[PDB]
Amino acid sequence: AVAPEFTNRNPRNLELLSVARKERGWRTVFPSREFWHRLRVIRTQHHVEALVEHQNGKVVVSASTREWAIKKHNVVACESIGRVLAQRCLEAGINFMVYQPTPWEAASDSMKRLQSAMTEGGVVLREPQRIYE
């Protein structure tokens, strides 16, 4: 009693298999929407938010300074937030990301420290190919 079209209902199945399709266009606008999991960071005064949005924009995990939990014990704060988000992604099962900041934000040492902490946690910002056919 096995159906011919067995359809598993894991939401992350196509993204993990990379078969999740992406919007090929929107190349003129910045940033492009051709990603599966994109790390969107919004840096503000004192507190800075960092989410990981899907193709629809589903920011499943956030790690900001306003959470009032890690308030006990800045580029160092950015590295700490990156490490915490990497641990949260490892717990939730995320290893493929898309970090696309501005070139000034790319030159930012806070972003570099956060990305280094994310790589130490085991989160790759590489966005691997979907593999055609």
Partner RNA sequence: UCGGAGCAGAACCCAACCUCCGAGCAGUACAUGCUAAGACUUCACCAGUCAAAGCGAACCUCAAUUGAUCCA
Partner RNA sequence: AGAGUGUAGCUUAAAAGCACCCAACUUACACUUAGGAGAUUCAAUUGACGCUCUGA
- Residue 54 contact among another protein, RNA, none, beta carbon within 5 to 8 Å by kind: another protein
Q: Kindly state the tokens that stand for 107.
A: 């030159």
How far is residue 105's CA from residue 79's CA, in Å, rounded to a whole number? 14
Q: Kindly state the tokens that stand for 12.
A: 């992350």
Q: Site residues for RNA, window 23-62 (CB under 7 A)?
A: 24, 43-48
How far is residue 28's CA from residue 67's CA, in Å, rounded to a whole number? 36
Give how many residues touch RNA by CB under 7 A: 24
* Contact indicator for 65, 48 with CB cutoff of 8 Å: yes
Q: Minimum distance between the CB of residue 84 and another protein, rounded to whole angstroms?
A: 5
Q: Site residues for another protein, window 40-79 (CB under 8 A)?
A: 54, 56-62, 67-74, 76-77
Q: Minimum distance between the CB of residue 94 and RNA, rounded to whole angstroms?
A: 22
The amino acid at 62:
S
Bridge partners, 88 (sequence order):
none
Consecutive H or E run containing 86 = helix 75-92
- Residue 125 contact among RNA, another protein, none, beta carbon within 5 to 8 Å by kind: none
Q: Minimum distance between the CB of residue 28 and another protein, rounded to whole angstroms?
A: 5
The amino acid at 105:
E
* Nearest CB to RNA, comparing residues 89 and 111: 111
Q: Kindly state the tokens that stand for 113.
A: 């420290």
The residues that touch RNA, with contacts defined as CB under 7 A, are 24, 43-48, 66, 68, 74-78, 102, 104-105, 107-111, 129, 132
